[PDB]
Design a protein around this ligand. Structure first.
Ligand code: CUA
Ligand SMILES: [Zn+2]
Ligand SMILES: [Zn+2]
Ligand SMILES: [Zn+2]
Lengths: 242, 386, 19, 210, 126, 52, 52, 126
């Protein structure tokens, strides 16, 4: 090479590989997290915001953004089939470190109040749909429909304990409502929430299923857009003037 | 804390706090106290603040140092938002439970929807003991009892941590089985295909199929534990019951009435002088005993000879005066002089910085026996510089 | 107290004296 | 010669990580009984002392680092031996890893940290402990480090000299567009690593070895 | 509104550093910041106080009330009316900072518009 | 100037001392602004916001 | 039971519930109607309040 | 809605001046203006007046009330309900001119849309 041997060449390739994986992980984490935090909020922060309609709607839609851009980077230039999981794991880690170290460690809110939304499972569907058909178009459609659909059921195991019922002073509450009332937040009045509150235009029984489908279909568009964003952020252009 | 920095006129012309008490100022971990009080919704509610039609009672405190076990306002358990009617009065109370050892400033607080926080009076509560000893607990419908402090948390980790781990394994796998630079080069050179081709796809198809299976199983298992569940309970509560006793602004045959007729506050910054046109209303001679503004109490030492249990901070023993029993049926105009440092310290003097130079609050009038009769005061006041 | 310009001045300088 | 060093990286990493750990311990301790009431004198001695101090320190460190990398720039950059170019760009990748970590602390840790604090106080001031660390320390730090990576590349690697990498521009400047209340993001590290790879690819014609 | 002063800061920041990127950032943050203080000398006489019929008004309010406009009801205004989320005392400073930061984005975009309006392209079909 | 930029480089258009004039002009500007601001707080030392 | 062209009146009373739910906008702005599958009967007039 | 007439105006303005630019302006202005008149002959019979229990109605309103729709409460409508800022008598003429002017923009945009939907590009990757 510009290398003194083959040993120096191999040693270089392997350790630049690590450094790139670690810098890219934490670079994507940063962007994803700020974006997600500012938009998906709010629903991710609090157990009593994780309702049947809003949460399983805004979350997959705002969450697919960085998964698509990460796939756009990892698949186009390397054929590595982990762009979604890469992004999604980063978000989880950034989130979980914070909930434990800060939400709880600093401000003593119990983890049952502040745990994040589960996303690895839909991220996987997203990544292997791209792997099986090296098509972003097929992924943008069927991949990101499965992303939507899978969101709620993959959260259910973490969430359901808190949807057990309690009677408090003659009025029904979920445990989640209770954890919200008990562990007092200074600026979280029940009404800033943005959770399902009923409508005359609901028939069934069908609240979560339609939210799931809605999120799938909307994510397609967001996926399309954010793929191309990942492309443009991939740019190797030099510009000459500033 | 912090209410000191909110605008004075907003603090004065929204919620007029009174009879706020704290039951215990010292509690062990797990011990209860009630924070209770009353609130009059000012009748000239400011444009800046959305209608208190949508509101939430709260314990103003630095995080959950005390856990809120119940709270009431209107005459109603109120875990959800409530409607306060303009010009009416509400009783409230909060049940709090010692959680973190320390010394903590705990306020009555109500938040209005397009409004923000309005902070009522607060008192220092010492909490002693060990947070390790804190328990709830809480009774489920099915009869069991959980400790909300720890409940459900392991089950969250048991689901979140394995997936976080399976996530990492999927990344490491591909990274190590034909890597970053080696793959950049391959794609950039000829085709990939030396990067991906079944059996790479086969692994993927397998992994996906196990993923979906684990998702289905986890879903069915969690329906077997927990087979009856409800959605989060949300929405405004039925209209509240105001205080009808007895009284008590704009209630009953016996009233006091107070029109404000111009006023002067020195800038800076310790005195407010106001002309009040009083109408008695009642069938007893009444003396002016109190002005309350933003939680603050300005007492007349003629009426409050000595001298209530109430926060620091807060309790001012000079809202003099002129002693002259206002007679039954009489209609008189009296000069009131509010003077205390607490006017400056709680930054009511910073009224000259607001876009509405105007006071608000309640005046309390007392009979020769017990009875307190309350009137709302409010209106334009002019600053006098230096 | 003044781990303001302490750990920060010291973090900046252990860096500059490694050039 | 060794094309791979890494000492500089571990120094930057240890120094940066222990510093933020000190900052986290410092806020666990002085967050309570110092940071809850911004009208108290304790707020001046424990929190505003940081703020008034860190801004000029970061500003001098930023201009000082750029100015240095420019004075020590390679005036003879087009002449660089393939090997030394390989080294210089392993060093760029070092800078970028430190920046990776800086971004994590600044945009994940302390940003979401502000989330929990908003539920703890009612705010006397724009300058809460959370904000002092997040907006006035944590962010400028990685902003500085980013400008350093850019300046190092502009001054050591022919390619990043004469040009301005559009992606690297977005990386250095993007931070100066972070503002909250009351998608266009930095992630252009994508383009930057592709340019590096574009360059590592070219520094070997006999690459049947991979 | 007074504007030459922030325009000068804008122009010379570009002069000293032939960068529109530096100007976009610091040039336009000065723009923001400098707005109000460069307006103060013209504006302050009218922020003197007057008591009209028991009520505080600025001379500016009074000039508004006095010199009757047919279609200017006090309410159409869009001026500060107070909020429970103000702490301080800080109203003009955060306005200035906000304007400076948002102007950066605006400046970026509008620079490129200036570039596009600058175009020397012929098109062949209409 | 159009010709100069269009031809070779500018630099025959702008270079210190052109920048110097500008740095001077800016510094006087900021001074005149600080002065007028201070002088107007001397007249009119107590003022109120628009009442609305 | 009615022949084509023959009238009938559908009538009744309604009490608006005092704890009107938040999910449903204020009945300040409302419309009376015959729930029916298309115009199987033609509505010839309606009244509520005491008002056509 | 009756649309063939304005559609014709649009087509022959393009024919007479093989310019989409002249069309986007004068063509689509005519498109606007012409709309109402070309509907008037189908519409006017329903704007004859009736009195029903003391209260004026058009036949349109009446066909509305009569032929019961399950989900068309009179308030979901979005029709003109009056304003204090109307002077005249001029309701339809200004709406016509408004729709002419706004259509120009929409026409410019959609022309190019048509061009992009006309694309004969091949892409290589999916
Ligand atoms: Cu002020 Cu607690
Ligand atoms: Zn325990
Ligand atoms: Zn060169
Ligand atoms: Zn914040």
């Amino acid at each position: 090479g510009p290398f003194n041997s083959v040993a120096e060449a191999a040693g270089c390739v392997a350790t630049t590989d690590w450094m790139l994986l670690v810098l890219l992980f934490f670079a994507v984490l940063g962007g994803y997290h700020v974006h997600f935090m500012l938009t998906a909020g709010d629903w991710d922060f609090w157990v009593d915001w994780k309702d049947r309609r809003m949460w399983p709607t805004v979350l997959p839609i705002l969450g697919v953004t960085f998964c698509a851009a990460s796939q756009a980077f990892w698949w186009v230039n390397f054929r590595l089939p982990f762009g979604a999981v890469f992004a999604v794991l980063g978000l989880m880690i950034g989130e979980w470190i914070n909930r434990y170290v800060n939400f709880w460690g600093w401000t003593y809110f119990p983890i049952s109040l502040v745990f994040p939304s589960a996303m690895i499972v839909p991220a996987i569907w997203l990544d292997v749909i791209l792997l099986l058909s090296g098509s972003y178009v097929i992924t943008a459609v069927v991949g990101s429909l499965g992303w939507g659909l899978l969101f709620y059921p993959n959260n259910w195991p973490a969430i359901a304990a808190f949807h057990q019922a309690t009677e408090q002073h003659g009025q029904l509450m979920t445990l989640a409502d209770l954890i919200g009332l008990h562990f007092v937040r200074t600026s979280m009045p029940e009404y800033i929430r943005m959770v399902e509150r009923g409508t005359l235009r609901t028939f069934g029984k069908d609240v979560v299923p339609v939210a799931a489908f809605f999120s799938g279909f909307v994510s397609m568009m967001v996926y399309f857009l954010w793929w191309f964003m990942g492309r443009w952020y991939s740019t190797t252009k030099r510009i000459e003037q500033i | 804390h912090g209410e000191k920095s909110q605008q004075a006129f907003l603090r004065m012309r929204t919620l007029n706090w009174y009879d706020v008490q704290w039951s215990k100022t010292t509690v062990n971990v797990n011990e209860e106290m009630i924070l209770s009080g009353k609130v009059h919704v000012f009748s000239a509610w400011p444009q800046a603040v959305a209608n208190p039609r949508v509101s939430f009672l709260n314990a103003g405190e630095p995080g959950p140092v005390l856990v809120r076990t119940a709270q009431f306002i209107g005459e109603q358990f109120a875990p959800r938002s409530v409607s306060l009617e303009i010009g009416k009065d509400y009783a409230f109370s909060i049940n709090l439970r010692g959680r973190r050892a320390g010394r903590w400033h705990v306020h009555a607080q109500i938040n209005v929807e397009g409004g923000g926080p309005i902070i009522g009076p607060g008192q220092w509560i010492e909490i002693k003991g060990d947070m390790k000893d804190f328990t709830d607990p809480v009774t489920l419908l099915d009869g069991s009892t959980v400790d909300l402090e720890n409940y459900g948390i392991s089950r969250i980790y048991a689901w979140h941590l394995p997936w976080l781990a399976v996530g990492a394994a999927w990344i490491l796998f591909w990274f190590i089985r034909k890597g970053i630079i080696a793959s950049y080069v391959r794609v950039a050179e000829g085709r990939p295909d030396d990067v991906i081709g079944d059996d790479d796809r086969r692994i993927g198809a397998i992994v996906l199929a196990l993923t979906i299976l684990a998702t289905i199983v986890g879903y069915a298992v969690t329906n077997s534990t927990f087979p009856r569940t409800i959605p989060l309970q949300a929405g405004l509560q039925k209209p509240l019951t105001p205080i009808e006793t007895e009284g008590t602004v704009g209630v009953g045959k016996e009233q006091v009435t107070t029109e404000l007729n111009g006023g002067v506050y020195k800038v800076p910054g310790r005195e407010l002088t106001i002309n009040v046109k009083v109408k008695n209303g009642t069938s007893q001679p009444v003396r002016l005993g109190e002005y309350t503004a933003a939680g603050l109490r300005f007492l007349n030492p003629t009426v409050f000879t000595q001298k209530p249990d109430f926060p620091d901070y807060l309790l001012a023993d000079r809202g003099l005066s002129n002693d002259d029993v206002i007679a039954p049926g009489e209609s008189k105009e009296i000069v009131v002089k509010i003077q205390d440092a607490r006017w400056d310290i709680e930054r009511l003097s910073d009224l000259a910085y607001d876009t509405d130079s105007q006071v608000g609050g309640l005046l309390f009038f007392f009979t020769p026996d017990g009875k307190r009769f309350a009137a709302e005061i409010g209106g334009p006041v002019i600053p006098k510089f230096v | 107290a003044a781990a303001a310009a302490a750990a920060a001045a010291a973090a900046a300088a252990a860096a500059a004296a490694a050039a | 010669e060794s094309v791979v060093d890494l000492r500089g990286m571990w120094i930057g990493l240890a120094v940066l990580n222990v510093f933020y750990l000190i900052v986290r311990i410092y806020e666990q301790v002085f967050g309570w009984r110092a940071g809850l009431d911004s009208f108290a004198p304790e707020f001046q001695t424990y929190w505003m002392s940081i703020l008034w101090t860190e801004i000029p320190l970061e500003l001098v460190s930023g201009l000082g680092l750029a100015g240095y990398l420019w004075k020590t720039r390679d005036r003879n950059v087009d002449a660089v031996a393939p090997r030394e170019e390989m080294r210089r760009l392993v060093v760029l990748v070092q800078w970028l890893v430190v920046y990776g970590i800086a971004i994590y602390w600044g945009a994940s840790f302390f940003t979401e940290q502000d989330g929990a604090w908003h539920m703890t106080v009612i705010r006397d001031t724009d300058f809460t402990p959370s904000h002092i660390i997040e907006f006035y320390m944590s962010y400028p730090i990685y902003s500085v480090i980013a400008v350093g990576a850019f300046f190092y590349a502009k001054t050591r690697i022919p390619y990043f000299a004469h040009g301005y990498s559009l992606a690297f521009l977005i990386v250095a400047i993007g931070p100066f567009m972070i503002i909250p209340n009351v998608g266009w993001m930095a992630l252009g590290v994508f383009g930057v690593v592709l340019q590096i790879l574009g360059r590592i690819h070219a520094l070997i014609g006999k690459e049947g070895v991979a």
